[PDB]
Structures are given as C-alpha cells and as structure tokens.
Amino acid sequence: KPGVFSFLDPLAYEIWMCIVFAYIGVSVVLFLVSRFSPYEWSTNEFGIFNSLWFSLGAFMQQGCDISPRSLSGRIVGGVWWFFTLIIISSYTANLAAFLTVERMVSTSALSLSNVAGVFYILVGGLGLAMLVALIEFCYKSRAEAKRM
Amino acid sequence: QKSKPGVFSFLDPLAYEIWMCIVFAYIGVSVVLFLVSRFSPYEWSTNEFGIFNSLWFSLGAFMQQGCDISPRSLSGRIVGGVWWFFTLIIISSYTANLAAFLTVERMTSALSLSNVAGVFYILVGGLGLAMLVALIEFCYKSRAEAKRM
Amino acid sequence: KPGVFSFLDPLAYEIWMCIVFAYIGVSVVLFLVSRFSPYEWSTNEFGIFNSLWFSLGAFMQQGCDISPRSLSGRIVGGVWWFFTLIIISSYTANLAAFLTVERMVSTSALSLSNVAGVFYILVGGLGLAMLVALIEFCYKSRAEAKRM
Amino acid sequence: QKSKPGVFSFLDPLAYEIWMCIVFAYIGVSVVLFLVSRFSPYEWSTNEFGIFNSLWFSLGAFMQQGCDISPRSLSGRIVGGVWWFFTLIIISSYTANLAAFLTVERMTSALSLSNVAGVFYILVGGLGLAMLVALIEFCYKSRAEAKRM
Amino acid sequence: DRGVQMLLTTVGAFAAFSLMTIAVGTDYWLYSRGVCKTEEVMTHSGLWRTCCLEGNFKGLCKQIDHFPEDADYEADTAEYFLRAVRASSIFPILSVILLFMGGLCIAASEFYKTRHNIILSAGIFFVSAGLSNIIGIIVYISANAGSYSYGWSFYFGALSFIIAEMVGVLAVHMFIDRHKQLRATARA
Amino acid sequence: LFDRGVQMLLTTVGAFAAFSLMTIAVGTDYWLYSRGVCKEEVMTHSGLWRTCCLEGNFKGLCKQIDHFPEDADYEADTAEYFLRAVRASSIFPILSVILLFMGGLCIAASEFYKTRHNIILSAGIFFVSAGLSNIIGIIVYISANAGSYSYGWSFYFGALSFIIAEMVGVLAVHMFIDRHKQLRATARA
Amino acid sequence: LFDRGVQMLLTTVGAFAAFSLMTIAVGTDYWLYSRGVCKEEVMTHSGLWRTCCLEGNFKGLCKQIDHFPEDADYEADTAEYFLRAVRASSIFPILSVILLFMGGLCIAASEFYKTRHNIILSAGIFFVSAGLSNIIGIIVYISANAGSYSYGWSFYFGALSFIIAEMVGVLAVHMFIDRHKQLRATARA
Amino acid sequence: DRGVQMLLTTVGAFAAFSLMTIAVGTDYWLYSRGVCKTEEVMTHSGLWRTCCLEGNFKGLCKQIDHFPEDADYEADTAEYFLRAVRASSIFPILSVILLFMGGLCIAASEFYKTRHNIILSAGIFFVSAGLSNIIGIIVYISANAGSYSYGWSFYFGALSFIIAEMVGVLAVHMFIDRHKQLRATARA
Ligand SMILES: [Cl-]
Ligand SMILES: [Cl-]
Ligand SMILES: [Cl-]
Ligand SMILES: [Cl-]
C-alpha cells in the first residue's frame, strides 16, 4: 500500500527541505547581482519574480524565456545548473534502485497509486491558479468600475 | 520462457490507468492555461496562449522539448510550474521502472527493434497524417482561391 | 576490455539504423509540410537545412531556435518528440540494466575506456567543422578577390 | 561495513579521468565554436558567439538547460551537434552508473543529505563568489565614475 | 457564428451533464470476480453497489462496503480519509453539480445579454467540473487498488470530462468575443 | 540547387536510380545471411521470397520462405498473424516500388503541359511516400526476422533507395516552390 | 512593495524578527529529538551545545554534546575532523547572527546621514550573506547529526530566520534601486 | 592594447610549446608499481621508458614495451591500432609540431603587417594543437587501462593544452580586430 506522496521516497526529507532553501537563496542572489547596480540600469529582465521563475525552470530543466548575460548572473546560473543536474540524476538513479531491489524480492507496471500524489498536487495547483486569476480579475474590475 | 515482445510493449513500465490519466491531465492543464491566460479583458492580447498554443506548450513541456513561448502572469506560471513538476516525476518514473524491468526478468542483452517497433509505427503514421492534413488544406485553399476569382 | 564504440551497446544496431532513417524522414516531411504551399508564403523559417537542425535538436533534447506553428508541422514535431522521449529513456534504462547486471556478477566507476569513442567522435566533429569553416572562408575570399 | 559517504561522493559514478577530459572537451568545444562563428570577416557580426557567449552556450548544452542563442552556420551546427551527442551519452552514463551503484552494494534506502552535501557546498560557494564579483565590479565603477567627474 | 457556437455550447453542456449523471447512477463501472449479497463469479460494480453476473444469483445487487472492518483495522489515517472520500463519491457528484450550474448559467445568459460575467461563470463551472471528474477518477482507481476491466459507465464519465472541457473552452471564447465586440464599438 | 535544367536531370536520374535499386532489392534474394535449411543447418542467403544454400552439400538450391510454418506453429495473436501477413506479402516494398514508378511517371509527364505545376508537387509527394513505405517495410522485415546473422547487399540496396527517394522528393518540392515563386514575380510585373 | 515609510518599517521589523529567531535558535537546546544518554538510552532533546533528558529517570539533566568522543573514536581524515570542528564551533549559525546584527545596525544607521545610499546596499548584502551562512550551518548540522529522530522548534526557528533574512534582503536592495532611481528622475528634470 | 596583446600571445605560445616539449621528453607521467629492466616496486614512467624508484635498482630506466606479445595474441585489430597509435606518441608529437608552427606564424606576422592571414593560420595551429593534445591524452589513458597517480609531466601536458587554447583565442581576436580596423578606414 504505497503512500499518496510516495514519489518523494528516493530522496530524504532533509534533501527536499534544503532544495527549497537553496532555490530561495539562488533566486535572491540572482536578483541581487542582476539588479543592484545603478550602472547596469535595466538591460536585463531579472527581477525577483523573474529570478524565481528562472530558477524554477532551471531546476525542472524546462525552457527559459531569459538567461543571465552578466558574469555574476552566469556564475549563479551555472552553479544552479550543476546542482540541478546532480539532484535530478540522483532522484532517477535512486528510484531505479528502489524499483529494481523491490523487483528481486521473493503488478510489474507502476500503478496509479504510486503517483496519485503528484496528480493531486497538479490538480490543486490548477485550482489555485484559477483562484488567483479570478481574484485578480475581480480586483481589476472593481478598480476600473470605481475609477469611472 | 521469454516471449517475443509485443508491438506496443514500450508502454509496459506504466499501467494503462496512468497513461489515461496523463492524457486527461494534459487536456485539463491545457484548458486551464488557456483560460487563465486569455479570459481577462484587462490582459488584452499581451500573451500568446490561445487554446492551440496552450496545447502545444503543454505537449512540449511533457516531452521536455522547451517552449517557443513562456507564461508571464502569476497564475499561468503556477500552471506551468505544477505541470513541470508532474512531468519530471512521471518521466523519471517511466525511466526507473523500465530499468527495473530490463534488469530483473520475471515469469542483459541489447534492445532489439521489436522492443520499439510500435513507436516507429506511430511515428510513420503521424508523418502520413500530417502529409494528409497539409494536402487537404492546400486543396481547400486552391478551390477557394479559384472560387473567389 | 570495452570496445571503443561500446557506448552504443544498449541499443541494437538495427535500432540505430532505423533512428537515422526516421530522422531523415521526419526532417523531409517537416520541410514538405512547412514550405510546399504557396498560400503560406515564407512566414516560417523551416527549410530543409533548418528542418534537419530542428529534428536533431529535438532528438538530442536540446534548445530550439524555432518551433512549428502550423497544424501539420506540429503533428510532425509531436510524434518526433514522443519517439525521442521513448528512445532516450530506453537507452538510459538498458544502460543501467547492463551496468547493474555486470555489477552483480561474482573498477566500480566508469572508466575513460568505456566512453573513449564519444570523445573521438567529438574531436573528429570539431576538426570537420574547422575544415568546413576554412573551406568556406577560402572560397568566399577567392570569390571576393576575383570579383574585384 | 558501509562507511559514511564522502563530501564529494556524487562524483563517484564517473572516474576522475572522465571529469578531467570533460573539462578539456568543454574548453575545446567552446574555443572551436567561437573560432568558426567569428573568424570570417564575411560573417561580420551576424551571430552572437563570442568567446564568453560560446562558453555559456557550451555550459548550457552540457547541463541541458537550453540556449538563448543557437548557431546558424553549417560548421557551428556541426560543433553543436557533436557536443549534444557527447552530452547525451555522458549524462546517461552518469545516471546509469549511479543507479548501478545504488542498487548493488559491494565491499535500498533514501539518499541522505550526506550524499549531496558537496554539491550544496559548491552551490553556496558559487553564490558567494558571484556576490563578490558583482560587488567588486560595482566598487570599480563607483571609483571610476567619480574619477572622471 | 454566434448562433452556431451557442447551440454547440448548450448541446455539449447537456451531453456532458447527462453522461455524468448516467455514469454516477449506473453500475457498469468495473467487471471483476467477487462474492454477492454478503462462491467466486464475475460481477459488475459501480459506485454504490455490486451485482452478480451470469452466476447462480445473477441479477442480484449488493451494496459495496467501503470500510472492510472485519479485522477492525485502521493503520494510518490517510487510508481512512481516502475511504471516506471514495465512499461518499463527493467528487463525481460535485462534477455533476458543477455541470448543472454551468448549464444554468448558460441558459440564463440569454435573458441578460448585457451581463457578460455569466458566460465567464459558466466557463469556470465547466472547467471545474472537468477537474472534479479527474480527481474522482483518480480516487476511484486508487481505492480499487487497495483480472478486471472498465465498463461503459466508467467511459461515460471519461467522455463527460472531455466534453465539459471543450464546452468550457467555447464559453471562454464567447466571453472574449463579447468583450472584443464591445471595445470595437467603444473605440469607434 | 541552382538553375532549372540541371535540377530536372538530377531529379529524373535520382528517381530512376531509386526505382532501379528498390526493384533490384525486391527481385533479389540477398537480404540476410544466416544458418538454415534449404529443402542440416548451413549458411544461407535469403531474401523476401526464397532462400538458397551457400557452401552446402547442394549449393544453389532455392526453396520458398516458410512464412506460416506447419506442424504445431503454436499459433499467435491477431497482431502476430497480421505481421506475418505483411511480411509474406511484402506489400510495403512493392508499394514503395509502385509509388516510385508513379512519381517518375509524374516527373516525365511534367515535360508535357508545363503549366500544370501540381504534377511536380504530386511527384514530390509520391517520392516522400515511397520513402515512408520503404521505412515501414524495413521495420516489418527486421521485426519478422528477429523472432549470428548479416544483412546482404539487397537489404542495403533498399536502404540506399529510401535515401535517394527523400533527396529526390526534396528537390521536387523545391521546383514547385520555385515555379510558384516565378509566377509571383511575373504577375507583379 | 509600495511607499517608503512602510518599507522602512517592514525591513526593520523583518531584521529584528530574523535576528531574534536566529539568536533563540543558537541559545536553545531543542534542535533534535533522539534516543541517547544524558550522563541507558532514553528520549532526549538536543541543541547545538548541550543535550538534556526527556521522560527519563532523572529528567532535566543536561550534559555537553560529545563532539570529539574519547575511548577509541577510530579517528578519520582531515575532512571529517574539519567537519566535526565546524559542527562543534557552530561558527555558521553564530556568523549568521553576527551578519544579521550588522545588517540591522546598517539599517538603523541608514536613517542618520540619509544621503549615504551605500549603507542600505550594505545592509542588503549582510542579510543575504546571513541567509547563506544559515544554509551552510543547517547543512553542516544535518550532516554531522547523521554520521527514529525528529527536529524541534529551535531547528525550525533557524529555518524561519533564513527565510526572513532573504525577504528582508530583497526589500533592502529594492530601496537601493529606488533611491538611485529617484536620483535619476530629479537630475533629468 | 596591440603591443600588450601581441606580447601576451607570444609569451603564451612559447610557454605552451616549452611545457609540451618538456612533458613529451620527461618520464614523470605516471607513478605505478612494476618490474624494471625486463620484484614489484614503485616506479615512474613517461611515454617511452619506465624507471625504478626508491628500489634496489633505483634510477635505472627500461623502455616501455607497448606490444606485450609474450602469449603472441592479437584478438581484434582495434587493440592493435590503438597500441600502434600509443607507441608512436604521434598525437603529443603532432601537438608539439603544431605549437611550433603557430609560434613560427606569430613571429613571421611582424615582418609582413599587410598579410593578415598569417595570424589566422597561427590561431588555427594553436587550436589544432590543443585538439591533438586532447586526443593524445585520451589515447594514453586508454592504453594504460588495457594504485597509480599522474606526475608533473602529465600536468605539464594538461597545462599546455589550456595555454594553447587561450593563445589561439587571442590570435583570432587579432585577425578580427585587424579586419575591423581595415574596414573602418575603408568605409571612412
Ligand atoms: Cl453503484
Ligand atoms: Cl526472393
Ligand atoms: Cl545548547
Ligand atoms: Cl618516456
């Protein structure tokens, strides 16, 4: 009877917590080095919101709308890329080890019970996104109606 | 004894229910992304996430093939982030369970073409389908152009 | 004593040959559906050279400068993406199986001898690229010097 | 008995010679890409592949993190293609050998933080280094601006 | 066209609602072998009861017990929460309610052409009904986990999800088009 | 790539070469080298239809390939019987031959009534489809064979024919693109 | 996010909150719950310096944490000894405390001599560095501990302090950005 | 500056050439235990000979045998081709030759300021020398494969590759700059 969030088993909980903290630190440092200098004012679209988006896309190994162009920003991006590559490969390798070792214990295909948790997370995120969009629409409409 | 692999045996690592729910989740993600990107008249568009474009973005995200466009609003980025996490987990699970299947045989050699014949059949079917669609569009426009003139 | 090109072991030679043929067919069909119609004249930069580049980047799962926009081109790209995902996952899974089964046979790290062939291919490609660039430069210089 | 993992034990799946040659190959690929992109005066530039940009492109290609720019000439595309194939093979080899290491113990549990403490240390060191570099650039410009005025 | 799009939207909404209502009410969700009226025989089950098929007691239905407390076991509370979610069938039922509310909004929009926010509410209801269908399907299969086939009631629910998302997309297209036409007049 | 007369000749010779190579592949029994019986196991050369002895007691003896073996074939599902039927028929290599011949016929007919630019497009589509059919036939053949061996020159004659088909198909579409490009320039005049 | 007076207040209270949480974490011995001896194994609550008995025969008895155990410790290389030294000293949590205090001093001092915009930037750098030092200290602590258990509130007081440090650091950089942005507008006119 | 860049380029070219020449000539490529003048003792070896270290026969060098044909074995031809490549050390030597040719081009560029193609040839030579160094390193380690450490002669070769890459980059910068300055005058 696999747990709902059993897809997180291959890495320990301390690794996940430190992944969150490292993500926050990398995003903050990328925003700091990209935007603090008045002499670079800007030529780059790396605010704190865009920095967090860049870091999240980098960890998920998905497409980037922007990439750092300065030396310090590229240093931050490169070390974050290395961290992401190592961590994702470790997750895949330990999951393969878990499944292989469970297979050689004295059905075969992965069941929906093994990934029901990521499904629940996805649907909850879709709901939260819809709530955010409708709240923004309502606030803007109230602002516009009161404006005129 | 080990039997000859089936045509669509590349789907074996994941259960049929997982594939069905992957399709359902892909449709839901595409529809919600299109909805949160374009419904608000105050965003009119600034983005490019129509229904077709949203389906394309979600398909590329699942196959991890980048994106010609990326969402910029908070809600669209929430949708993209959760879809990215889902895709990462699911693809890693497919790879890991395939490795487990290939390591331990129940009742190692190089993969033969029979292990992956079905993806080749699907690829060629898709090429033929795209050719048919392009030809039908061209023929439709050729008659319509002559009709107007 | 691993062979020079022993990194190709996890997939059979028939799979590699069919991968090459499928790549050629996908590139040709993408060029055909993107460019044959005079009514689309073009709004897309998908020539035969750019289509081959797109297909190679798609198989290697690397960045794309362009992506198909039409229905037929997106059909071709989607089926090619699915093929690529399946094939690459199969390569990784069978390599893991090979290494694990060799490990459980009655040093540990991968040696340079296991991957010397990909290094040889990379350096040969760098040399061929330099030769192409210098030949193009020489031909252009001869064209320009003879022009005036 | 199983000993406590070393700080930089994430490098174990590949031999030290492989890592050294990966660095050498990355430098060679970056230099050759810059050379074939920019040497010809008849291409002046049409592309954006300077030495810094070429190093960035090669680093992104190895980490499979996409590209802000892509080569367009035949020779640059040859360099990019061979680097892509190299990266695919090497990353898959790292993952597969790590899976083999984690499956079979020589002389399964979740990965502890001690298995990845080294990559965490490298990440934080890189963040500090980038901060120092940005501060040094700002301080240099602040004195130079006041010097001119 | 405005008329064609509205007709397609209302027909799709009605079809999705009817399919989901029939799927929730019928008993052909799963074909599996099991005992009745508490001998192994192939049966068909839905969301509330299971009935024997081609057996000695063929045609007789027995209510599904969602809390197998023969051994009086609890283990962790996640299993109990999942069983409570599955036993009530709150998510398929909520999908039915959301489909009905979206259809109501679509119907009421004809009376009030000035109010464009009703169309948006209908689209939101249809998309939310699809998501509720997704969650319900996941819960149902997961509860089943802890030979078999899926019957036409299961695919009645699956086909309902696809139709609901399509009608939701069409409804959002109308909210956009209504706002665009309003602004073309306003700018002119 | 340049001019028009050279492109015509190149496309025509490519079509003829691809057609000849595919026809030779279909009509010749050197597709696979393996141990087998041609009436004790001995080295044999086999094709799509018949297999003949090599360096055996009776060299040069040919028998029809057993596509549906007798004596308790153990049966199979609908998919495996279907694959065996596609293998026995060899429709996809023959379909490729037919499509190559019809593309060549379109290219030859494009000399007459040169205003019909849709003929060249049809020839390009035919050549692309012939290549796709060749790919399917190759995959079916390898899958049916698999379930030491080497592939002979008739198998590689088919591989080369598929490559020529796409290159000729690419050129034919270029002509259709250039022919309609030329019509736009003169109308603007 | 808006105005200037609220941003000053938000940054100051964030700095004070992060400093208080980190100082409480350093000075309190509830970082880990595990079985052990505080003088037979029994449930204990432990911190950075001392561990005390919980629900044992003698509750509330505290002893200093054995960072370099006697009686055949079996030794190690310089790497593990260095890690043990960083753990025993706890110089990264204390360094985080010092950097937070100095960032707060810069923020408070920035109100005097308001023309010195480089003070706010220094405060932002200090807060970001305090967060990074907190991360390093957490990683060192978790690695040394693991070389059933639960983490107490002092460990999570440190986790919350790191988060506040980055958010306050983000706000301080925004002020430096806005202060220099304001100087450009007045020079433009 | 033009002068500073030329000075850096020539110093780097000379340093890379000297390091590669010393690495090829010296015998501190690898520390390993093996027999001499063919007892196990730790030795140091280069590309042509191995010499005993801190042993009974300390200081005595024996030529490395690259074709261990005691059992008269051939196996596949790939092994023989690799052994022939390794025994000749054709790739480190070719790297030395390419470095010397690049330095020659750099020196001759001063005499003919009008001819800008000499600088480009020097850059090509330096980049090719680096690639030859890469291939030679790979071949050497692979031949070794079919406890040990690498000595300073190995890292003399590695440091030579990095320097040759940098000087090649600098030389290409000059070819670009010369063409840019020529066109600034031509356009003006
Ligand atoms: Cl029911
Ligand atoms: Cl035959
Ligand atoms: Cl304490
Ligand atoms: Cl030597």
Curated annotation (Swiss-Prot), chains A, C:
Known partners and oligomeric status: Homotetramer or heterotetramer of pore-forming glutamate receptor subunits. Tetramers may be formed by the dimerization of dimers. May interact with MPP4. Forms a ternary complex with GRIP1 and CSPG4. Interacts with ATAD1 in an ATP-dependent manner. ATAD1-catalyzed ATP hydrolysis disrupts binding to ATAD1 and to GRIP1 and leads to AMPAR complex disassembly. Interacts with GRIP2. Interacts with GRIP1. Interacts with NSF via its C-terminus. Interacts with CACNG2, PICK1 and GRIP2. Interacts with GRIA1 and SYNDIG1. Part of a complex containing GRIA2, NSF and NAPA and/or NAPB.
Coiled-coil regions, chain positions: none
Cytoplasmic compartment segments: 65-70
Source species of the chain: Rattus norvegicus
Post-translational modification, as annotated: Palmitoylated. Depalmitoylated upon L-glutamate stimulation. Cys-64 palmitoylation leads to Golgi retention and decreased cell surface expression. In contrast, Cys-138 palmitoylation does not affect cell surface expression but regulates stimulation-dependent endocytosis.
Similarity field: Belongs to the glutamate-gated ion channel (TC 1.A.10.1) family. GRIA2 subfamily.
Lipidation sites (S-palmitoyl cysteine): 64, 138
Stretches that traverse the bilayer: 13-33, 71-91, 115-135
Intramembrane segments: 46-61, 62-64
Gene: Gria2
Induction / repression: Down-regulated in the pyramidal cell layer of CA1 in the hippocampus by global ischemia.
Subcellular location: Cell membrane; Postsynaptic cell membrane; Postsynaptic density membrane
Extra remark beyond the main annotation: The postsynaptic actions of L-glutamate are mediated by a variety of receptors that are named according to their selective agonists. This receptor binds AMPA (quisqualate) > L-glutamate > kainate.
Tissues in which the protein is found: Detected in forebrain. Detected in dendrites of neuronal cells. Expressed in the pyramidal cell layers of CA1 and CA3 and in the granule cell layer of the dentate gyrus.
Name the record gives this protein: Glutamate receptor 2
Record's comment describing the protein's domains: The M4 transmembrane segment mediates tetramerization and is required for cell surface expression.
Reported function: Ionotropic glutamate receptor that functions as a ligand-gated cation channel, gated by L-glutamate and glutamatergic agonists such as alpha-amino-3-hydroxy-5-methyl-4-isoxazolepropionic acid (AMPA), quisqualic acid, and kainic acid. L-glutamate acts as an excitatory neurotransmitter at many synapses in the central nervous system and plays an important role in fast excitatory synaptic transmission.
Range covered out of full length: 532 to 846 of 883
UniProtKB/Swiss-Prot annotation, chains F, G:
Compartments, as annotated in UniProt: Membrane; Synapse, Synaptosome
Domain of life: Eukaryota
Gene Ontology molecular function, alphabetical: ionotropic glutamate receptor binding; voltage-gated calcium channel activity
The keyword Signal is assigned to this record: no
Keywords in alphabetical order: Calcium, Calcium channel, Calcium transport, Glycoprotein, Ion channel, Ion transport, Membrane, Phosphoprotein, Synapse, Synaptosome, Transmembrane, Transmembrane helix, Transport, Voltage-gated channel
Bilayer topology: Multi-pass membrane protein
Assembly behavior: The L-type calcium channel is composed of five subunits: alpha-1, alpha-2/delta, beta and gamma. Interacts with the PDZ domains of DLG4/PSD-95 and DLG1/SAP97. May interact with GOPC. Acts as an auxiliary subunit for AMPA-selective glutamate receptors (AMPARs). Found in a complex with GRIA1, GRIA2, GRIA3, GRIA4, CNIH2, CNIH3, CACNG3, CACNG4, CACNG5, CACNG7 and CACNG8. Interacts with GRIA1 and GRIA2. Interacts with MPP2.
Protein name: Voltage-dependent calcium channel gamma-2 subunit
Provenance organism: Mus musculus (Mouse)
Designated gene of the protein: Cacng2
Whole-protein coverage range: 3 to 214 of 323
